[PDB]
């Protein structure tokens, strides 16, 4: 929390002064992995092995994915989160977006001289913007920006989950799954305040015969994940009933 985290960023900056932009990441991953190999944690050392291999090969997206999983299961880890944000910032610059890279860099700077996890989550949303900005959508970036602004003034770890749902909608809107109208309706429902009208809209579109049994369950499980970290038991039951109806019946 402000210590043992600023040294990692300082070393990253020294090894990035050259301009390699890839050996600094590997050195930071090494620094993190040494602190967790000296312990008796064999679940994190192997994960950092895989992450370093992915970064060295060039497949940083898999690294950000599995580091995201790690930081979600265990948010106590703060150097792992710092290296995750560094890899996110490095990957964003490869996608072709220089202003999102600047936003993530300032997020790293504010995370180093603090220790609050509320910035890490914010970085995720910025990262997601890049992804959403690459799939083609432009009207989905604004909702993500609104969530990003609302995270930096509330610090709720439940606003990145809605961004994950929006990313899922953007992904399905491209491949050939659920069409534009449902995407816009669900985005509008997730935007304002509704996580219960989303369930009803998905069910209504499923019964009317406009959504497959796989995309509907994907959206419903994402909504259940959002509703399991909000302290709601009148929406966990609703999501469970909807998943039961769509899945089997
Ligand atoms: Zn993996
Ligand atoms: Zn039925």
Q: Which ligand is nearest to the CA of 245?
A: 2
Under a CB-based contact definition with an 8 Å cutoff, are residues 220 and 239 in contact?
yes
Are both 193 and 118 inside the same structural domain? no
Are both 118 and 163 inside the same structural domain? no
- For 230, the token pair is 């909000």
Are both 123 and 47 inside the same structural domain? yes
Structural domain harbouring 229: 142-249
Distance 230 CA to ligand 2 centre (A): 28
Angle between helical axes of 79-95 and 23-37 (0-180°, round to 10): 160
- Given 107, 135, 163, which residue is the final one in a domain? 135
Q: Which ligand is nearest to the CA of 249?
A: 2
Distance 172 CA to ligand 2 centre (A): 23
Write down the experimental method used for this entry: cryo-EM
User: What are the φ and ψ backbone dihedral angles of 152, each rounded to 5 degrees?
Assistant: -85, 10
Under a CB-based contact definition with an 8 Å cutoff, are residues 160 and 75 in contact?
no
3-state DSSP helix/strand/coil % of the chain, to nearest 5:
75, 0, 25
Distance 23 CA to ligand 2 centre (A): 55
Distance 151 CA to ligand 2 centre (A): 38
Distance 43 CA to ligand 1 centre (A): 13
User: What are the φ and ψ backbone dihedral angles of 164, each rounded to 5 degrees?
Assistant: -65, -40
- Given 106, 135, 164, which residue is the final one in a domain? 135
Under a CB-based contact definition with an 8 Å cutoff, are residues 108 and 82 in contact?
yes
Distance 233 CA to ligand 1 centre (A): 33
Local structure of residue 21 (DSSP, 8 states): S
Are both 21 and 90 inside the same structural domain? yes
Distance 65 CA to ligand 1 centre (A): 8
- Given 135, 161, 192, which residue is the final one in a domain? 135
Are both 52 and 73 inside the same structural domain? yes
Cα–chain center distance at 223: 15
The CA-atom distances, in angstroms, between 235 and each of 171, 220, 241 are 25, 11, 10
Instruction: Give resolution, Å, one decimal.
Output: 3.1
The CA-atom distances, in angstroms, between 141 and each of 100, 106, 181 are 12, 19, 17
Are both 150 and 216 inside the same structural domain? yes
Maximal CA-CA distance, the chain? 60
Distance 66 CA to ligand 1 centre (A): 6
Are both 147 and 131 inside the same structural domain? no
Q: Which ligand is nearest to the CA of 54?
A: 1
**Number of domains making up the chain:** 2
Gap between the Cα atoms of 82 and 7, Å rounded: 11
Distance 44 CA to ligand 1 centre (A): 13
Are both 107 and 229 inside the same structural domain? no
Q: Which ligand is nearest to the CA of 68?
A: 1
Angle between helical axes of 42-57 and 79-95 (0-180°, round to 10): 20
The HSE-up count of residue 201 (CA atoms within 13 Å, CB side) is 18
């Amino acid at each position: 929390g402000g210590t043992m985290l600023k040294e990692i960023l300082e070393a990253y900056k020294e090894i990035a002064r050259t301009g390699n932009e890839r050996e600094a990441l590997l050195r930071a991953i090494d620094i993190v992995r040494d602190k967790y190999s000296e312990k008796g944690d064999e679940e994190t050392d192997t994960l950092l092995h895989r992450v370093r291999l992915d970064v060295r090969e060039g497949n940083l997206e898999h690294a950000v994915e599995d580091l995201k999983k790690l930081v979600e299961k265990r948010p106590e880890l703060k150097d792992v989160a710092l290296v995750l944000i560094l890899i996110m910032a490095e990957e964003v610059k490869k996608l072709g977006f220089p202003e999102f890279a600047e936003k993530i860099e300032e997020l790293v700077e504010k995370f180093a001289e603090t220790g609050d996890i509320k910035y890490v989550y914010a970085a995720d949303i910025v990262y997601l913007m890049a992804l959403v900005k690459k799939l083609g959508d432009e009207e989905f970036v604004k909702i993500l920006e609104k969530f990003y602004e609302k995270l930096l003034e509330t610090g709720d770890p439940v606003y990145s989950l809605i961004a994950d749902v929006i990313l899922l909608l953007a992904k399905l809107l491209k491949e050939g799954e659920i069409s534009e109208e449902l995407a816009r309706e669900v985005a509008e429902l997730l935007e304002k305040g509704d996580l219960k009208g989303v369930v009803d809209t998905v069910l209504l579109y499923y019964l009317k015969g406009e959504v497959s049994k796989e995309a509907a369950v994907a959206i419903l499980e994402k909504i259940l994940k959002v509703a399991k970290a909000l302290g709601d038991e009148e929406l966990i039951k609703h999501a469970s009933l909807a998943i039961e109806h769509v899945k089997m019946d």
